[PDB]
Amino acid sequence: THHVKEGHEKADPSQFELLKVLGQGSFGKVFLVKKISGSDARQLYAMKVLKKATLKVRDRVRTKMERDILVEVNHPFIVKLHYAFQTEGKLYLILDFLRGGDLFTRLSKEVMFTEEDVKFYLAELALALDHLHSLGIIYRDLKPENILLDEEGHIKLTDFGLSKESIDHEKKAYSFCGTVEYMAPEVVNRRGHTQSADWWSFGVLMFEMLTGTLPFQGKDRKETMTMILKAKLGMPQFLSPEAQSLLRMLFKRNPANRLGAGPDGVEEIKRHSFFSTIDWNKLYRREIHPPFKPATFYFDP
Ligand SMILES: CN1CCN(c2ccc(-c3ccncc3-c3cc(F)c(O)c(F)c3)cc2)CC1
Numbered sequence: 001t002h003h004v005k006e007g008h009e010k011a012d013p014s015q016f017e018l019l020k021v022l023g024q025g026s027f028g029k030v031f032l033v034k035k036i037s038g039s040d041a042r043q044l045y046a047m048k049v050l051k052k053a054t055l056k057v058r059d060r061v062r063t064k065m066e067r068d069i070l071v072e073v074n075h076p077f078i079v080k081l082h083y084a085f086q087t088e089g090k091l092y093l094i095l096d097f098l099r100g101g102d103l104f105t106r107l108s109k110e111v112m113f114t115e116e117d118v119k120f121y122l123a124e125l126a127l128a129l130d131h132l133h134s135l136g137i138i139y140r141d142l143k144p145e146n147i148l149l150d151e152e153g154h155i156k157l158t159d160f161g162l163s164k165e166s167i168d169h170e171k172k173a174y175s176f177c178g179t180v181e182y183m184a185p186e187v188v189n190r191r192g193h194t195q196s197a198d199w200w201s202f203g204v205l206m207f208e209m210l211t212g213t214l215p216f217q218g219k220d221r222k223e224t225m226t227m228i229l230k231a232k233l234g235m236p237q238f239l240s241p242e243a244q245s246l247l248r249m250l251f252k253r254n255p256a257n258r259l260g261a262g263p264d265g266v267e268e269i270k271r272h273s274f275f276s277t278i279d280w281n282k283l284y285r286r287e288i289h290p291p292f293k294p295a296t297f298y299f300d301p
Contacts, residue, residue: 011083050091069162077128078157098156100149100294112212117291123278124155130266133195138165141178142201153290168193180224181214185253188225196255203250211236246274
């Protein structure tokens, strides 16, 4: 072997100026940062910092998986990872900075969305999910908090729910993660989180955005789970027949019979009547205008 070293200009946390704390949680802390040095100097990013001491084995395994998945993904509707580095006591992920907020913050203000907006948000999401499926990846927590918006108003699916289907299948017996209300019957019964389970959560999110409420929810965790399994849902009648049809096809308890599980795959969702006004090629090319868009006294002659 050749005992010669490769020269490189490595990144470290001191190349990123701290602007403000965007959020905090069990995962760690998120900051808005400004790159100081390099070709991307002055560029803004979201910096997620995880303390190695406030980190379980499962937490360390999970972070490594998210980083590896993000390095493998390039899609217009999924968050991009720009950097990953570590210190003796901390782990850093440098991701896209998204100024448009999240779908949950927006849902809480509006109470409910129009079919026009739900059709736009779900169509971009369907593309993001199918791209993940093409790489053997599933989304274990498809809640509206995990979908951010950019300056234009296009969606960006976060990394927080990213899991590999092969890894998830081997751990399913000793692993119970995610938000209960969004779980497919087979996930509640620990039979495994398949691509079909992503299309059930996709319908839960659809129902919540259109009606302002979750379709299967009880007085506690236990009741919600039994409700997901019995699955006897009343369809709000202010919903269009197209929205109602899509919801019933997605809320099929047998994962094999659920819309998207068939031979055509995502084409079963794409060709549904609810999405007939969507040009899927133009949408992917970000050529479709978002129906919603996120974010002096003196006068003289
Ligand atoms: C409990 N909350 C705490 C705050 N949290 C939260 C989520 C997103 C953000 C956030 C805000 C703005 N831009 C990017 C991110 C971001 C995106 C990702 F894909 C991440 O992986 C990440 F780390 C940060 C800011 C806070 C959501 C969950």
